């Protein structure tokens, strides 16, 4: 059987946030939670964060290691298909003030080949001190 | 009239490869699942190996080294097919999504290049590590 392969493309524009601890709760936001982004117009400055397991070798057989998030625009990434505010398990709605959530921007989703990883700012307030990311500069 | 055929013929993987971006590049490391996308399979199905190939072209002399290129087979398919999840072999790294069962068989089998052209990579839940690209195949 071919596989189906649904989706236009899951590499975040941003670099994760990181959990700090195996049993982290999910993020949680000064302000809005969407990346810095002025490519865009605010009634589409919505999205979501999407929880990934990781895992380290050795020691072992895989041992776990703190869940990272990645953030995509609402239609794109694996949750492609979910509405704004659509309950998931591993899933965080953020939308701006001003923000439509029914709005869909063209923004699309990262190719990893022609582009590096986009620094996360969160200029009204990032996540709290359950996470953590590392520094990439402007 | 034809005889029986019960090998994975010259069939080829299911996606396109990873390819390593130097001729001494790392094998390829999964911190999450390394498992592309294919909506046809449940979680517990989500493990297989990738598969290095060696790669050479034409030039100056003759043979020129080209960095790795590595393909993805569902776990009882492909080249080595004979190995159970987790088999230690020299250009085999075994992946699987968080929740996998390494002994479910699925059922993908291979891709006949004769009738379907190589699937997109996508990866919800990690791919591999920045030593390797591959070219953006869209839909």
């Known amino acids: 059987r071919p596989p189906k392969v649904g989706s236009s493309g899951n590499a975040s524009w941003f670099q994760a946030i990181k959990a700090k601890k195996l049993?982290?709760?999910?993020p949680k936001?000064?302000?809005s939670g969407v990346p810095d982004n002025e490519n865009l117009k605010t009634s589409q400055q919505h999205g979501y964060w999407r929880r990934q397991a990781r895992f380290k070798p050795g020691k072992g057989r895989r041992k776990?290691?703190?869940?990272?998030w990645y953030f995509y625009y609402?239609?794109?990434?694996?949750?492609?298909d979910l509405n704004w505010g659509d309950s998931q398990d591993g899933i965080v709605w953020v939308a701006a003030k001003?923000?439509?959530?029914?709005?869909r921007s063209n923004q699309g989703t990262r190719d990893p080949d022609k582009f590096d990883q986009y620094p996360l700012r969160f200029?009204?307030?990032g996540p709290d001190g359950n996470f953590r990311w590392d520094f990439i500069p402007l």
């Not at 776990?64 to 990272?68: E, G, K």
């Not at 609402?74 to 492609?80: E, V």
């Not at 001003?98 to 709005?103: H, L, P, Q, Y």
Request: net charge negative; hydrophobic share 25%; no cysteine.
């Open 64 to 68: 776990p290691v703190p869940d990272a």
């Open 98 to 103: 001003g923000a439509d959530v029914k709005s």
């Open 29 to 31: 936001f000064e302000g």
């Open 74 to 80: 609402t239609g794109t990434g694996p949750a492609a």
């Open 23 to 26: 049993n982290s709760p999910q």
């Open 123 to 125: 200029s009204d307030g």
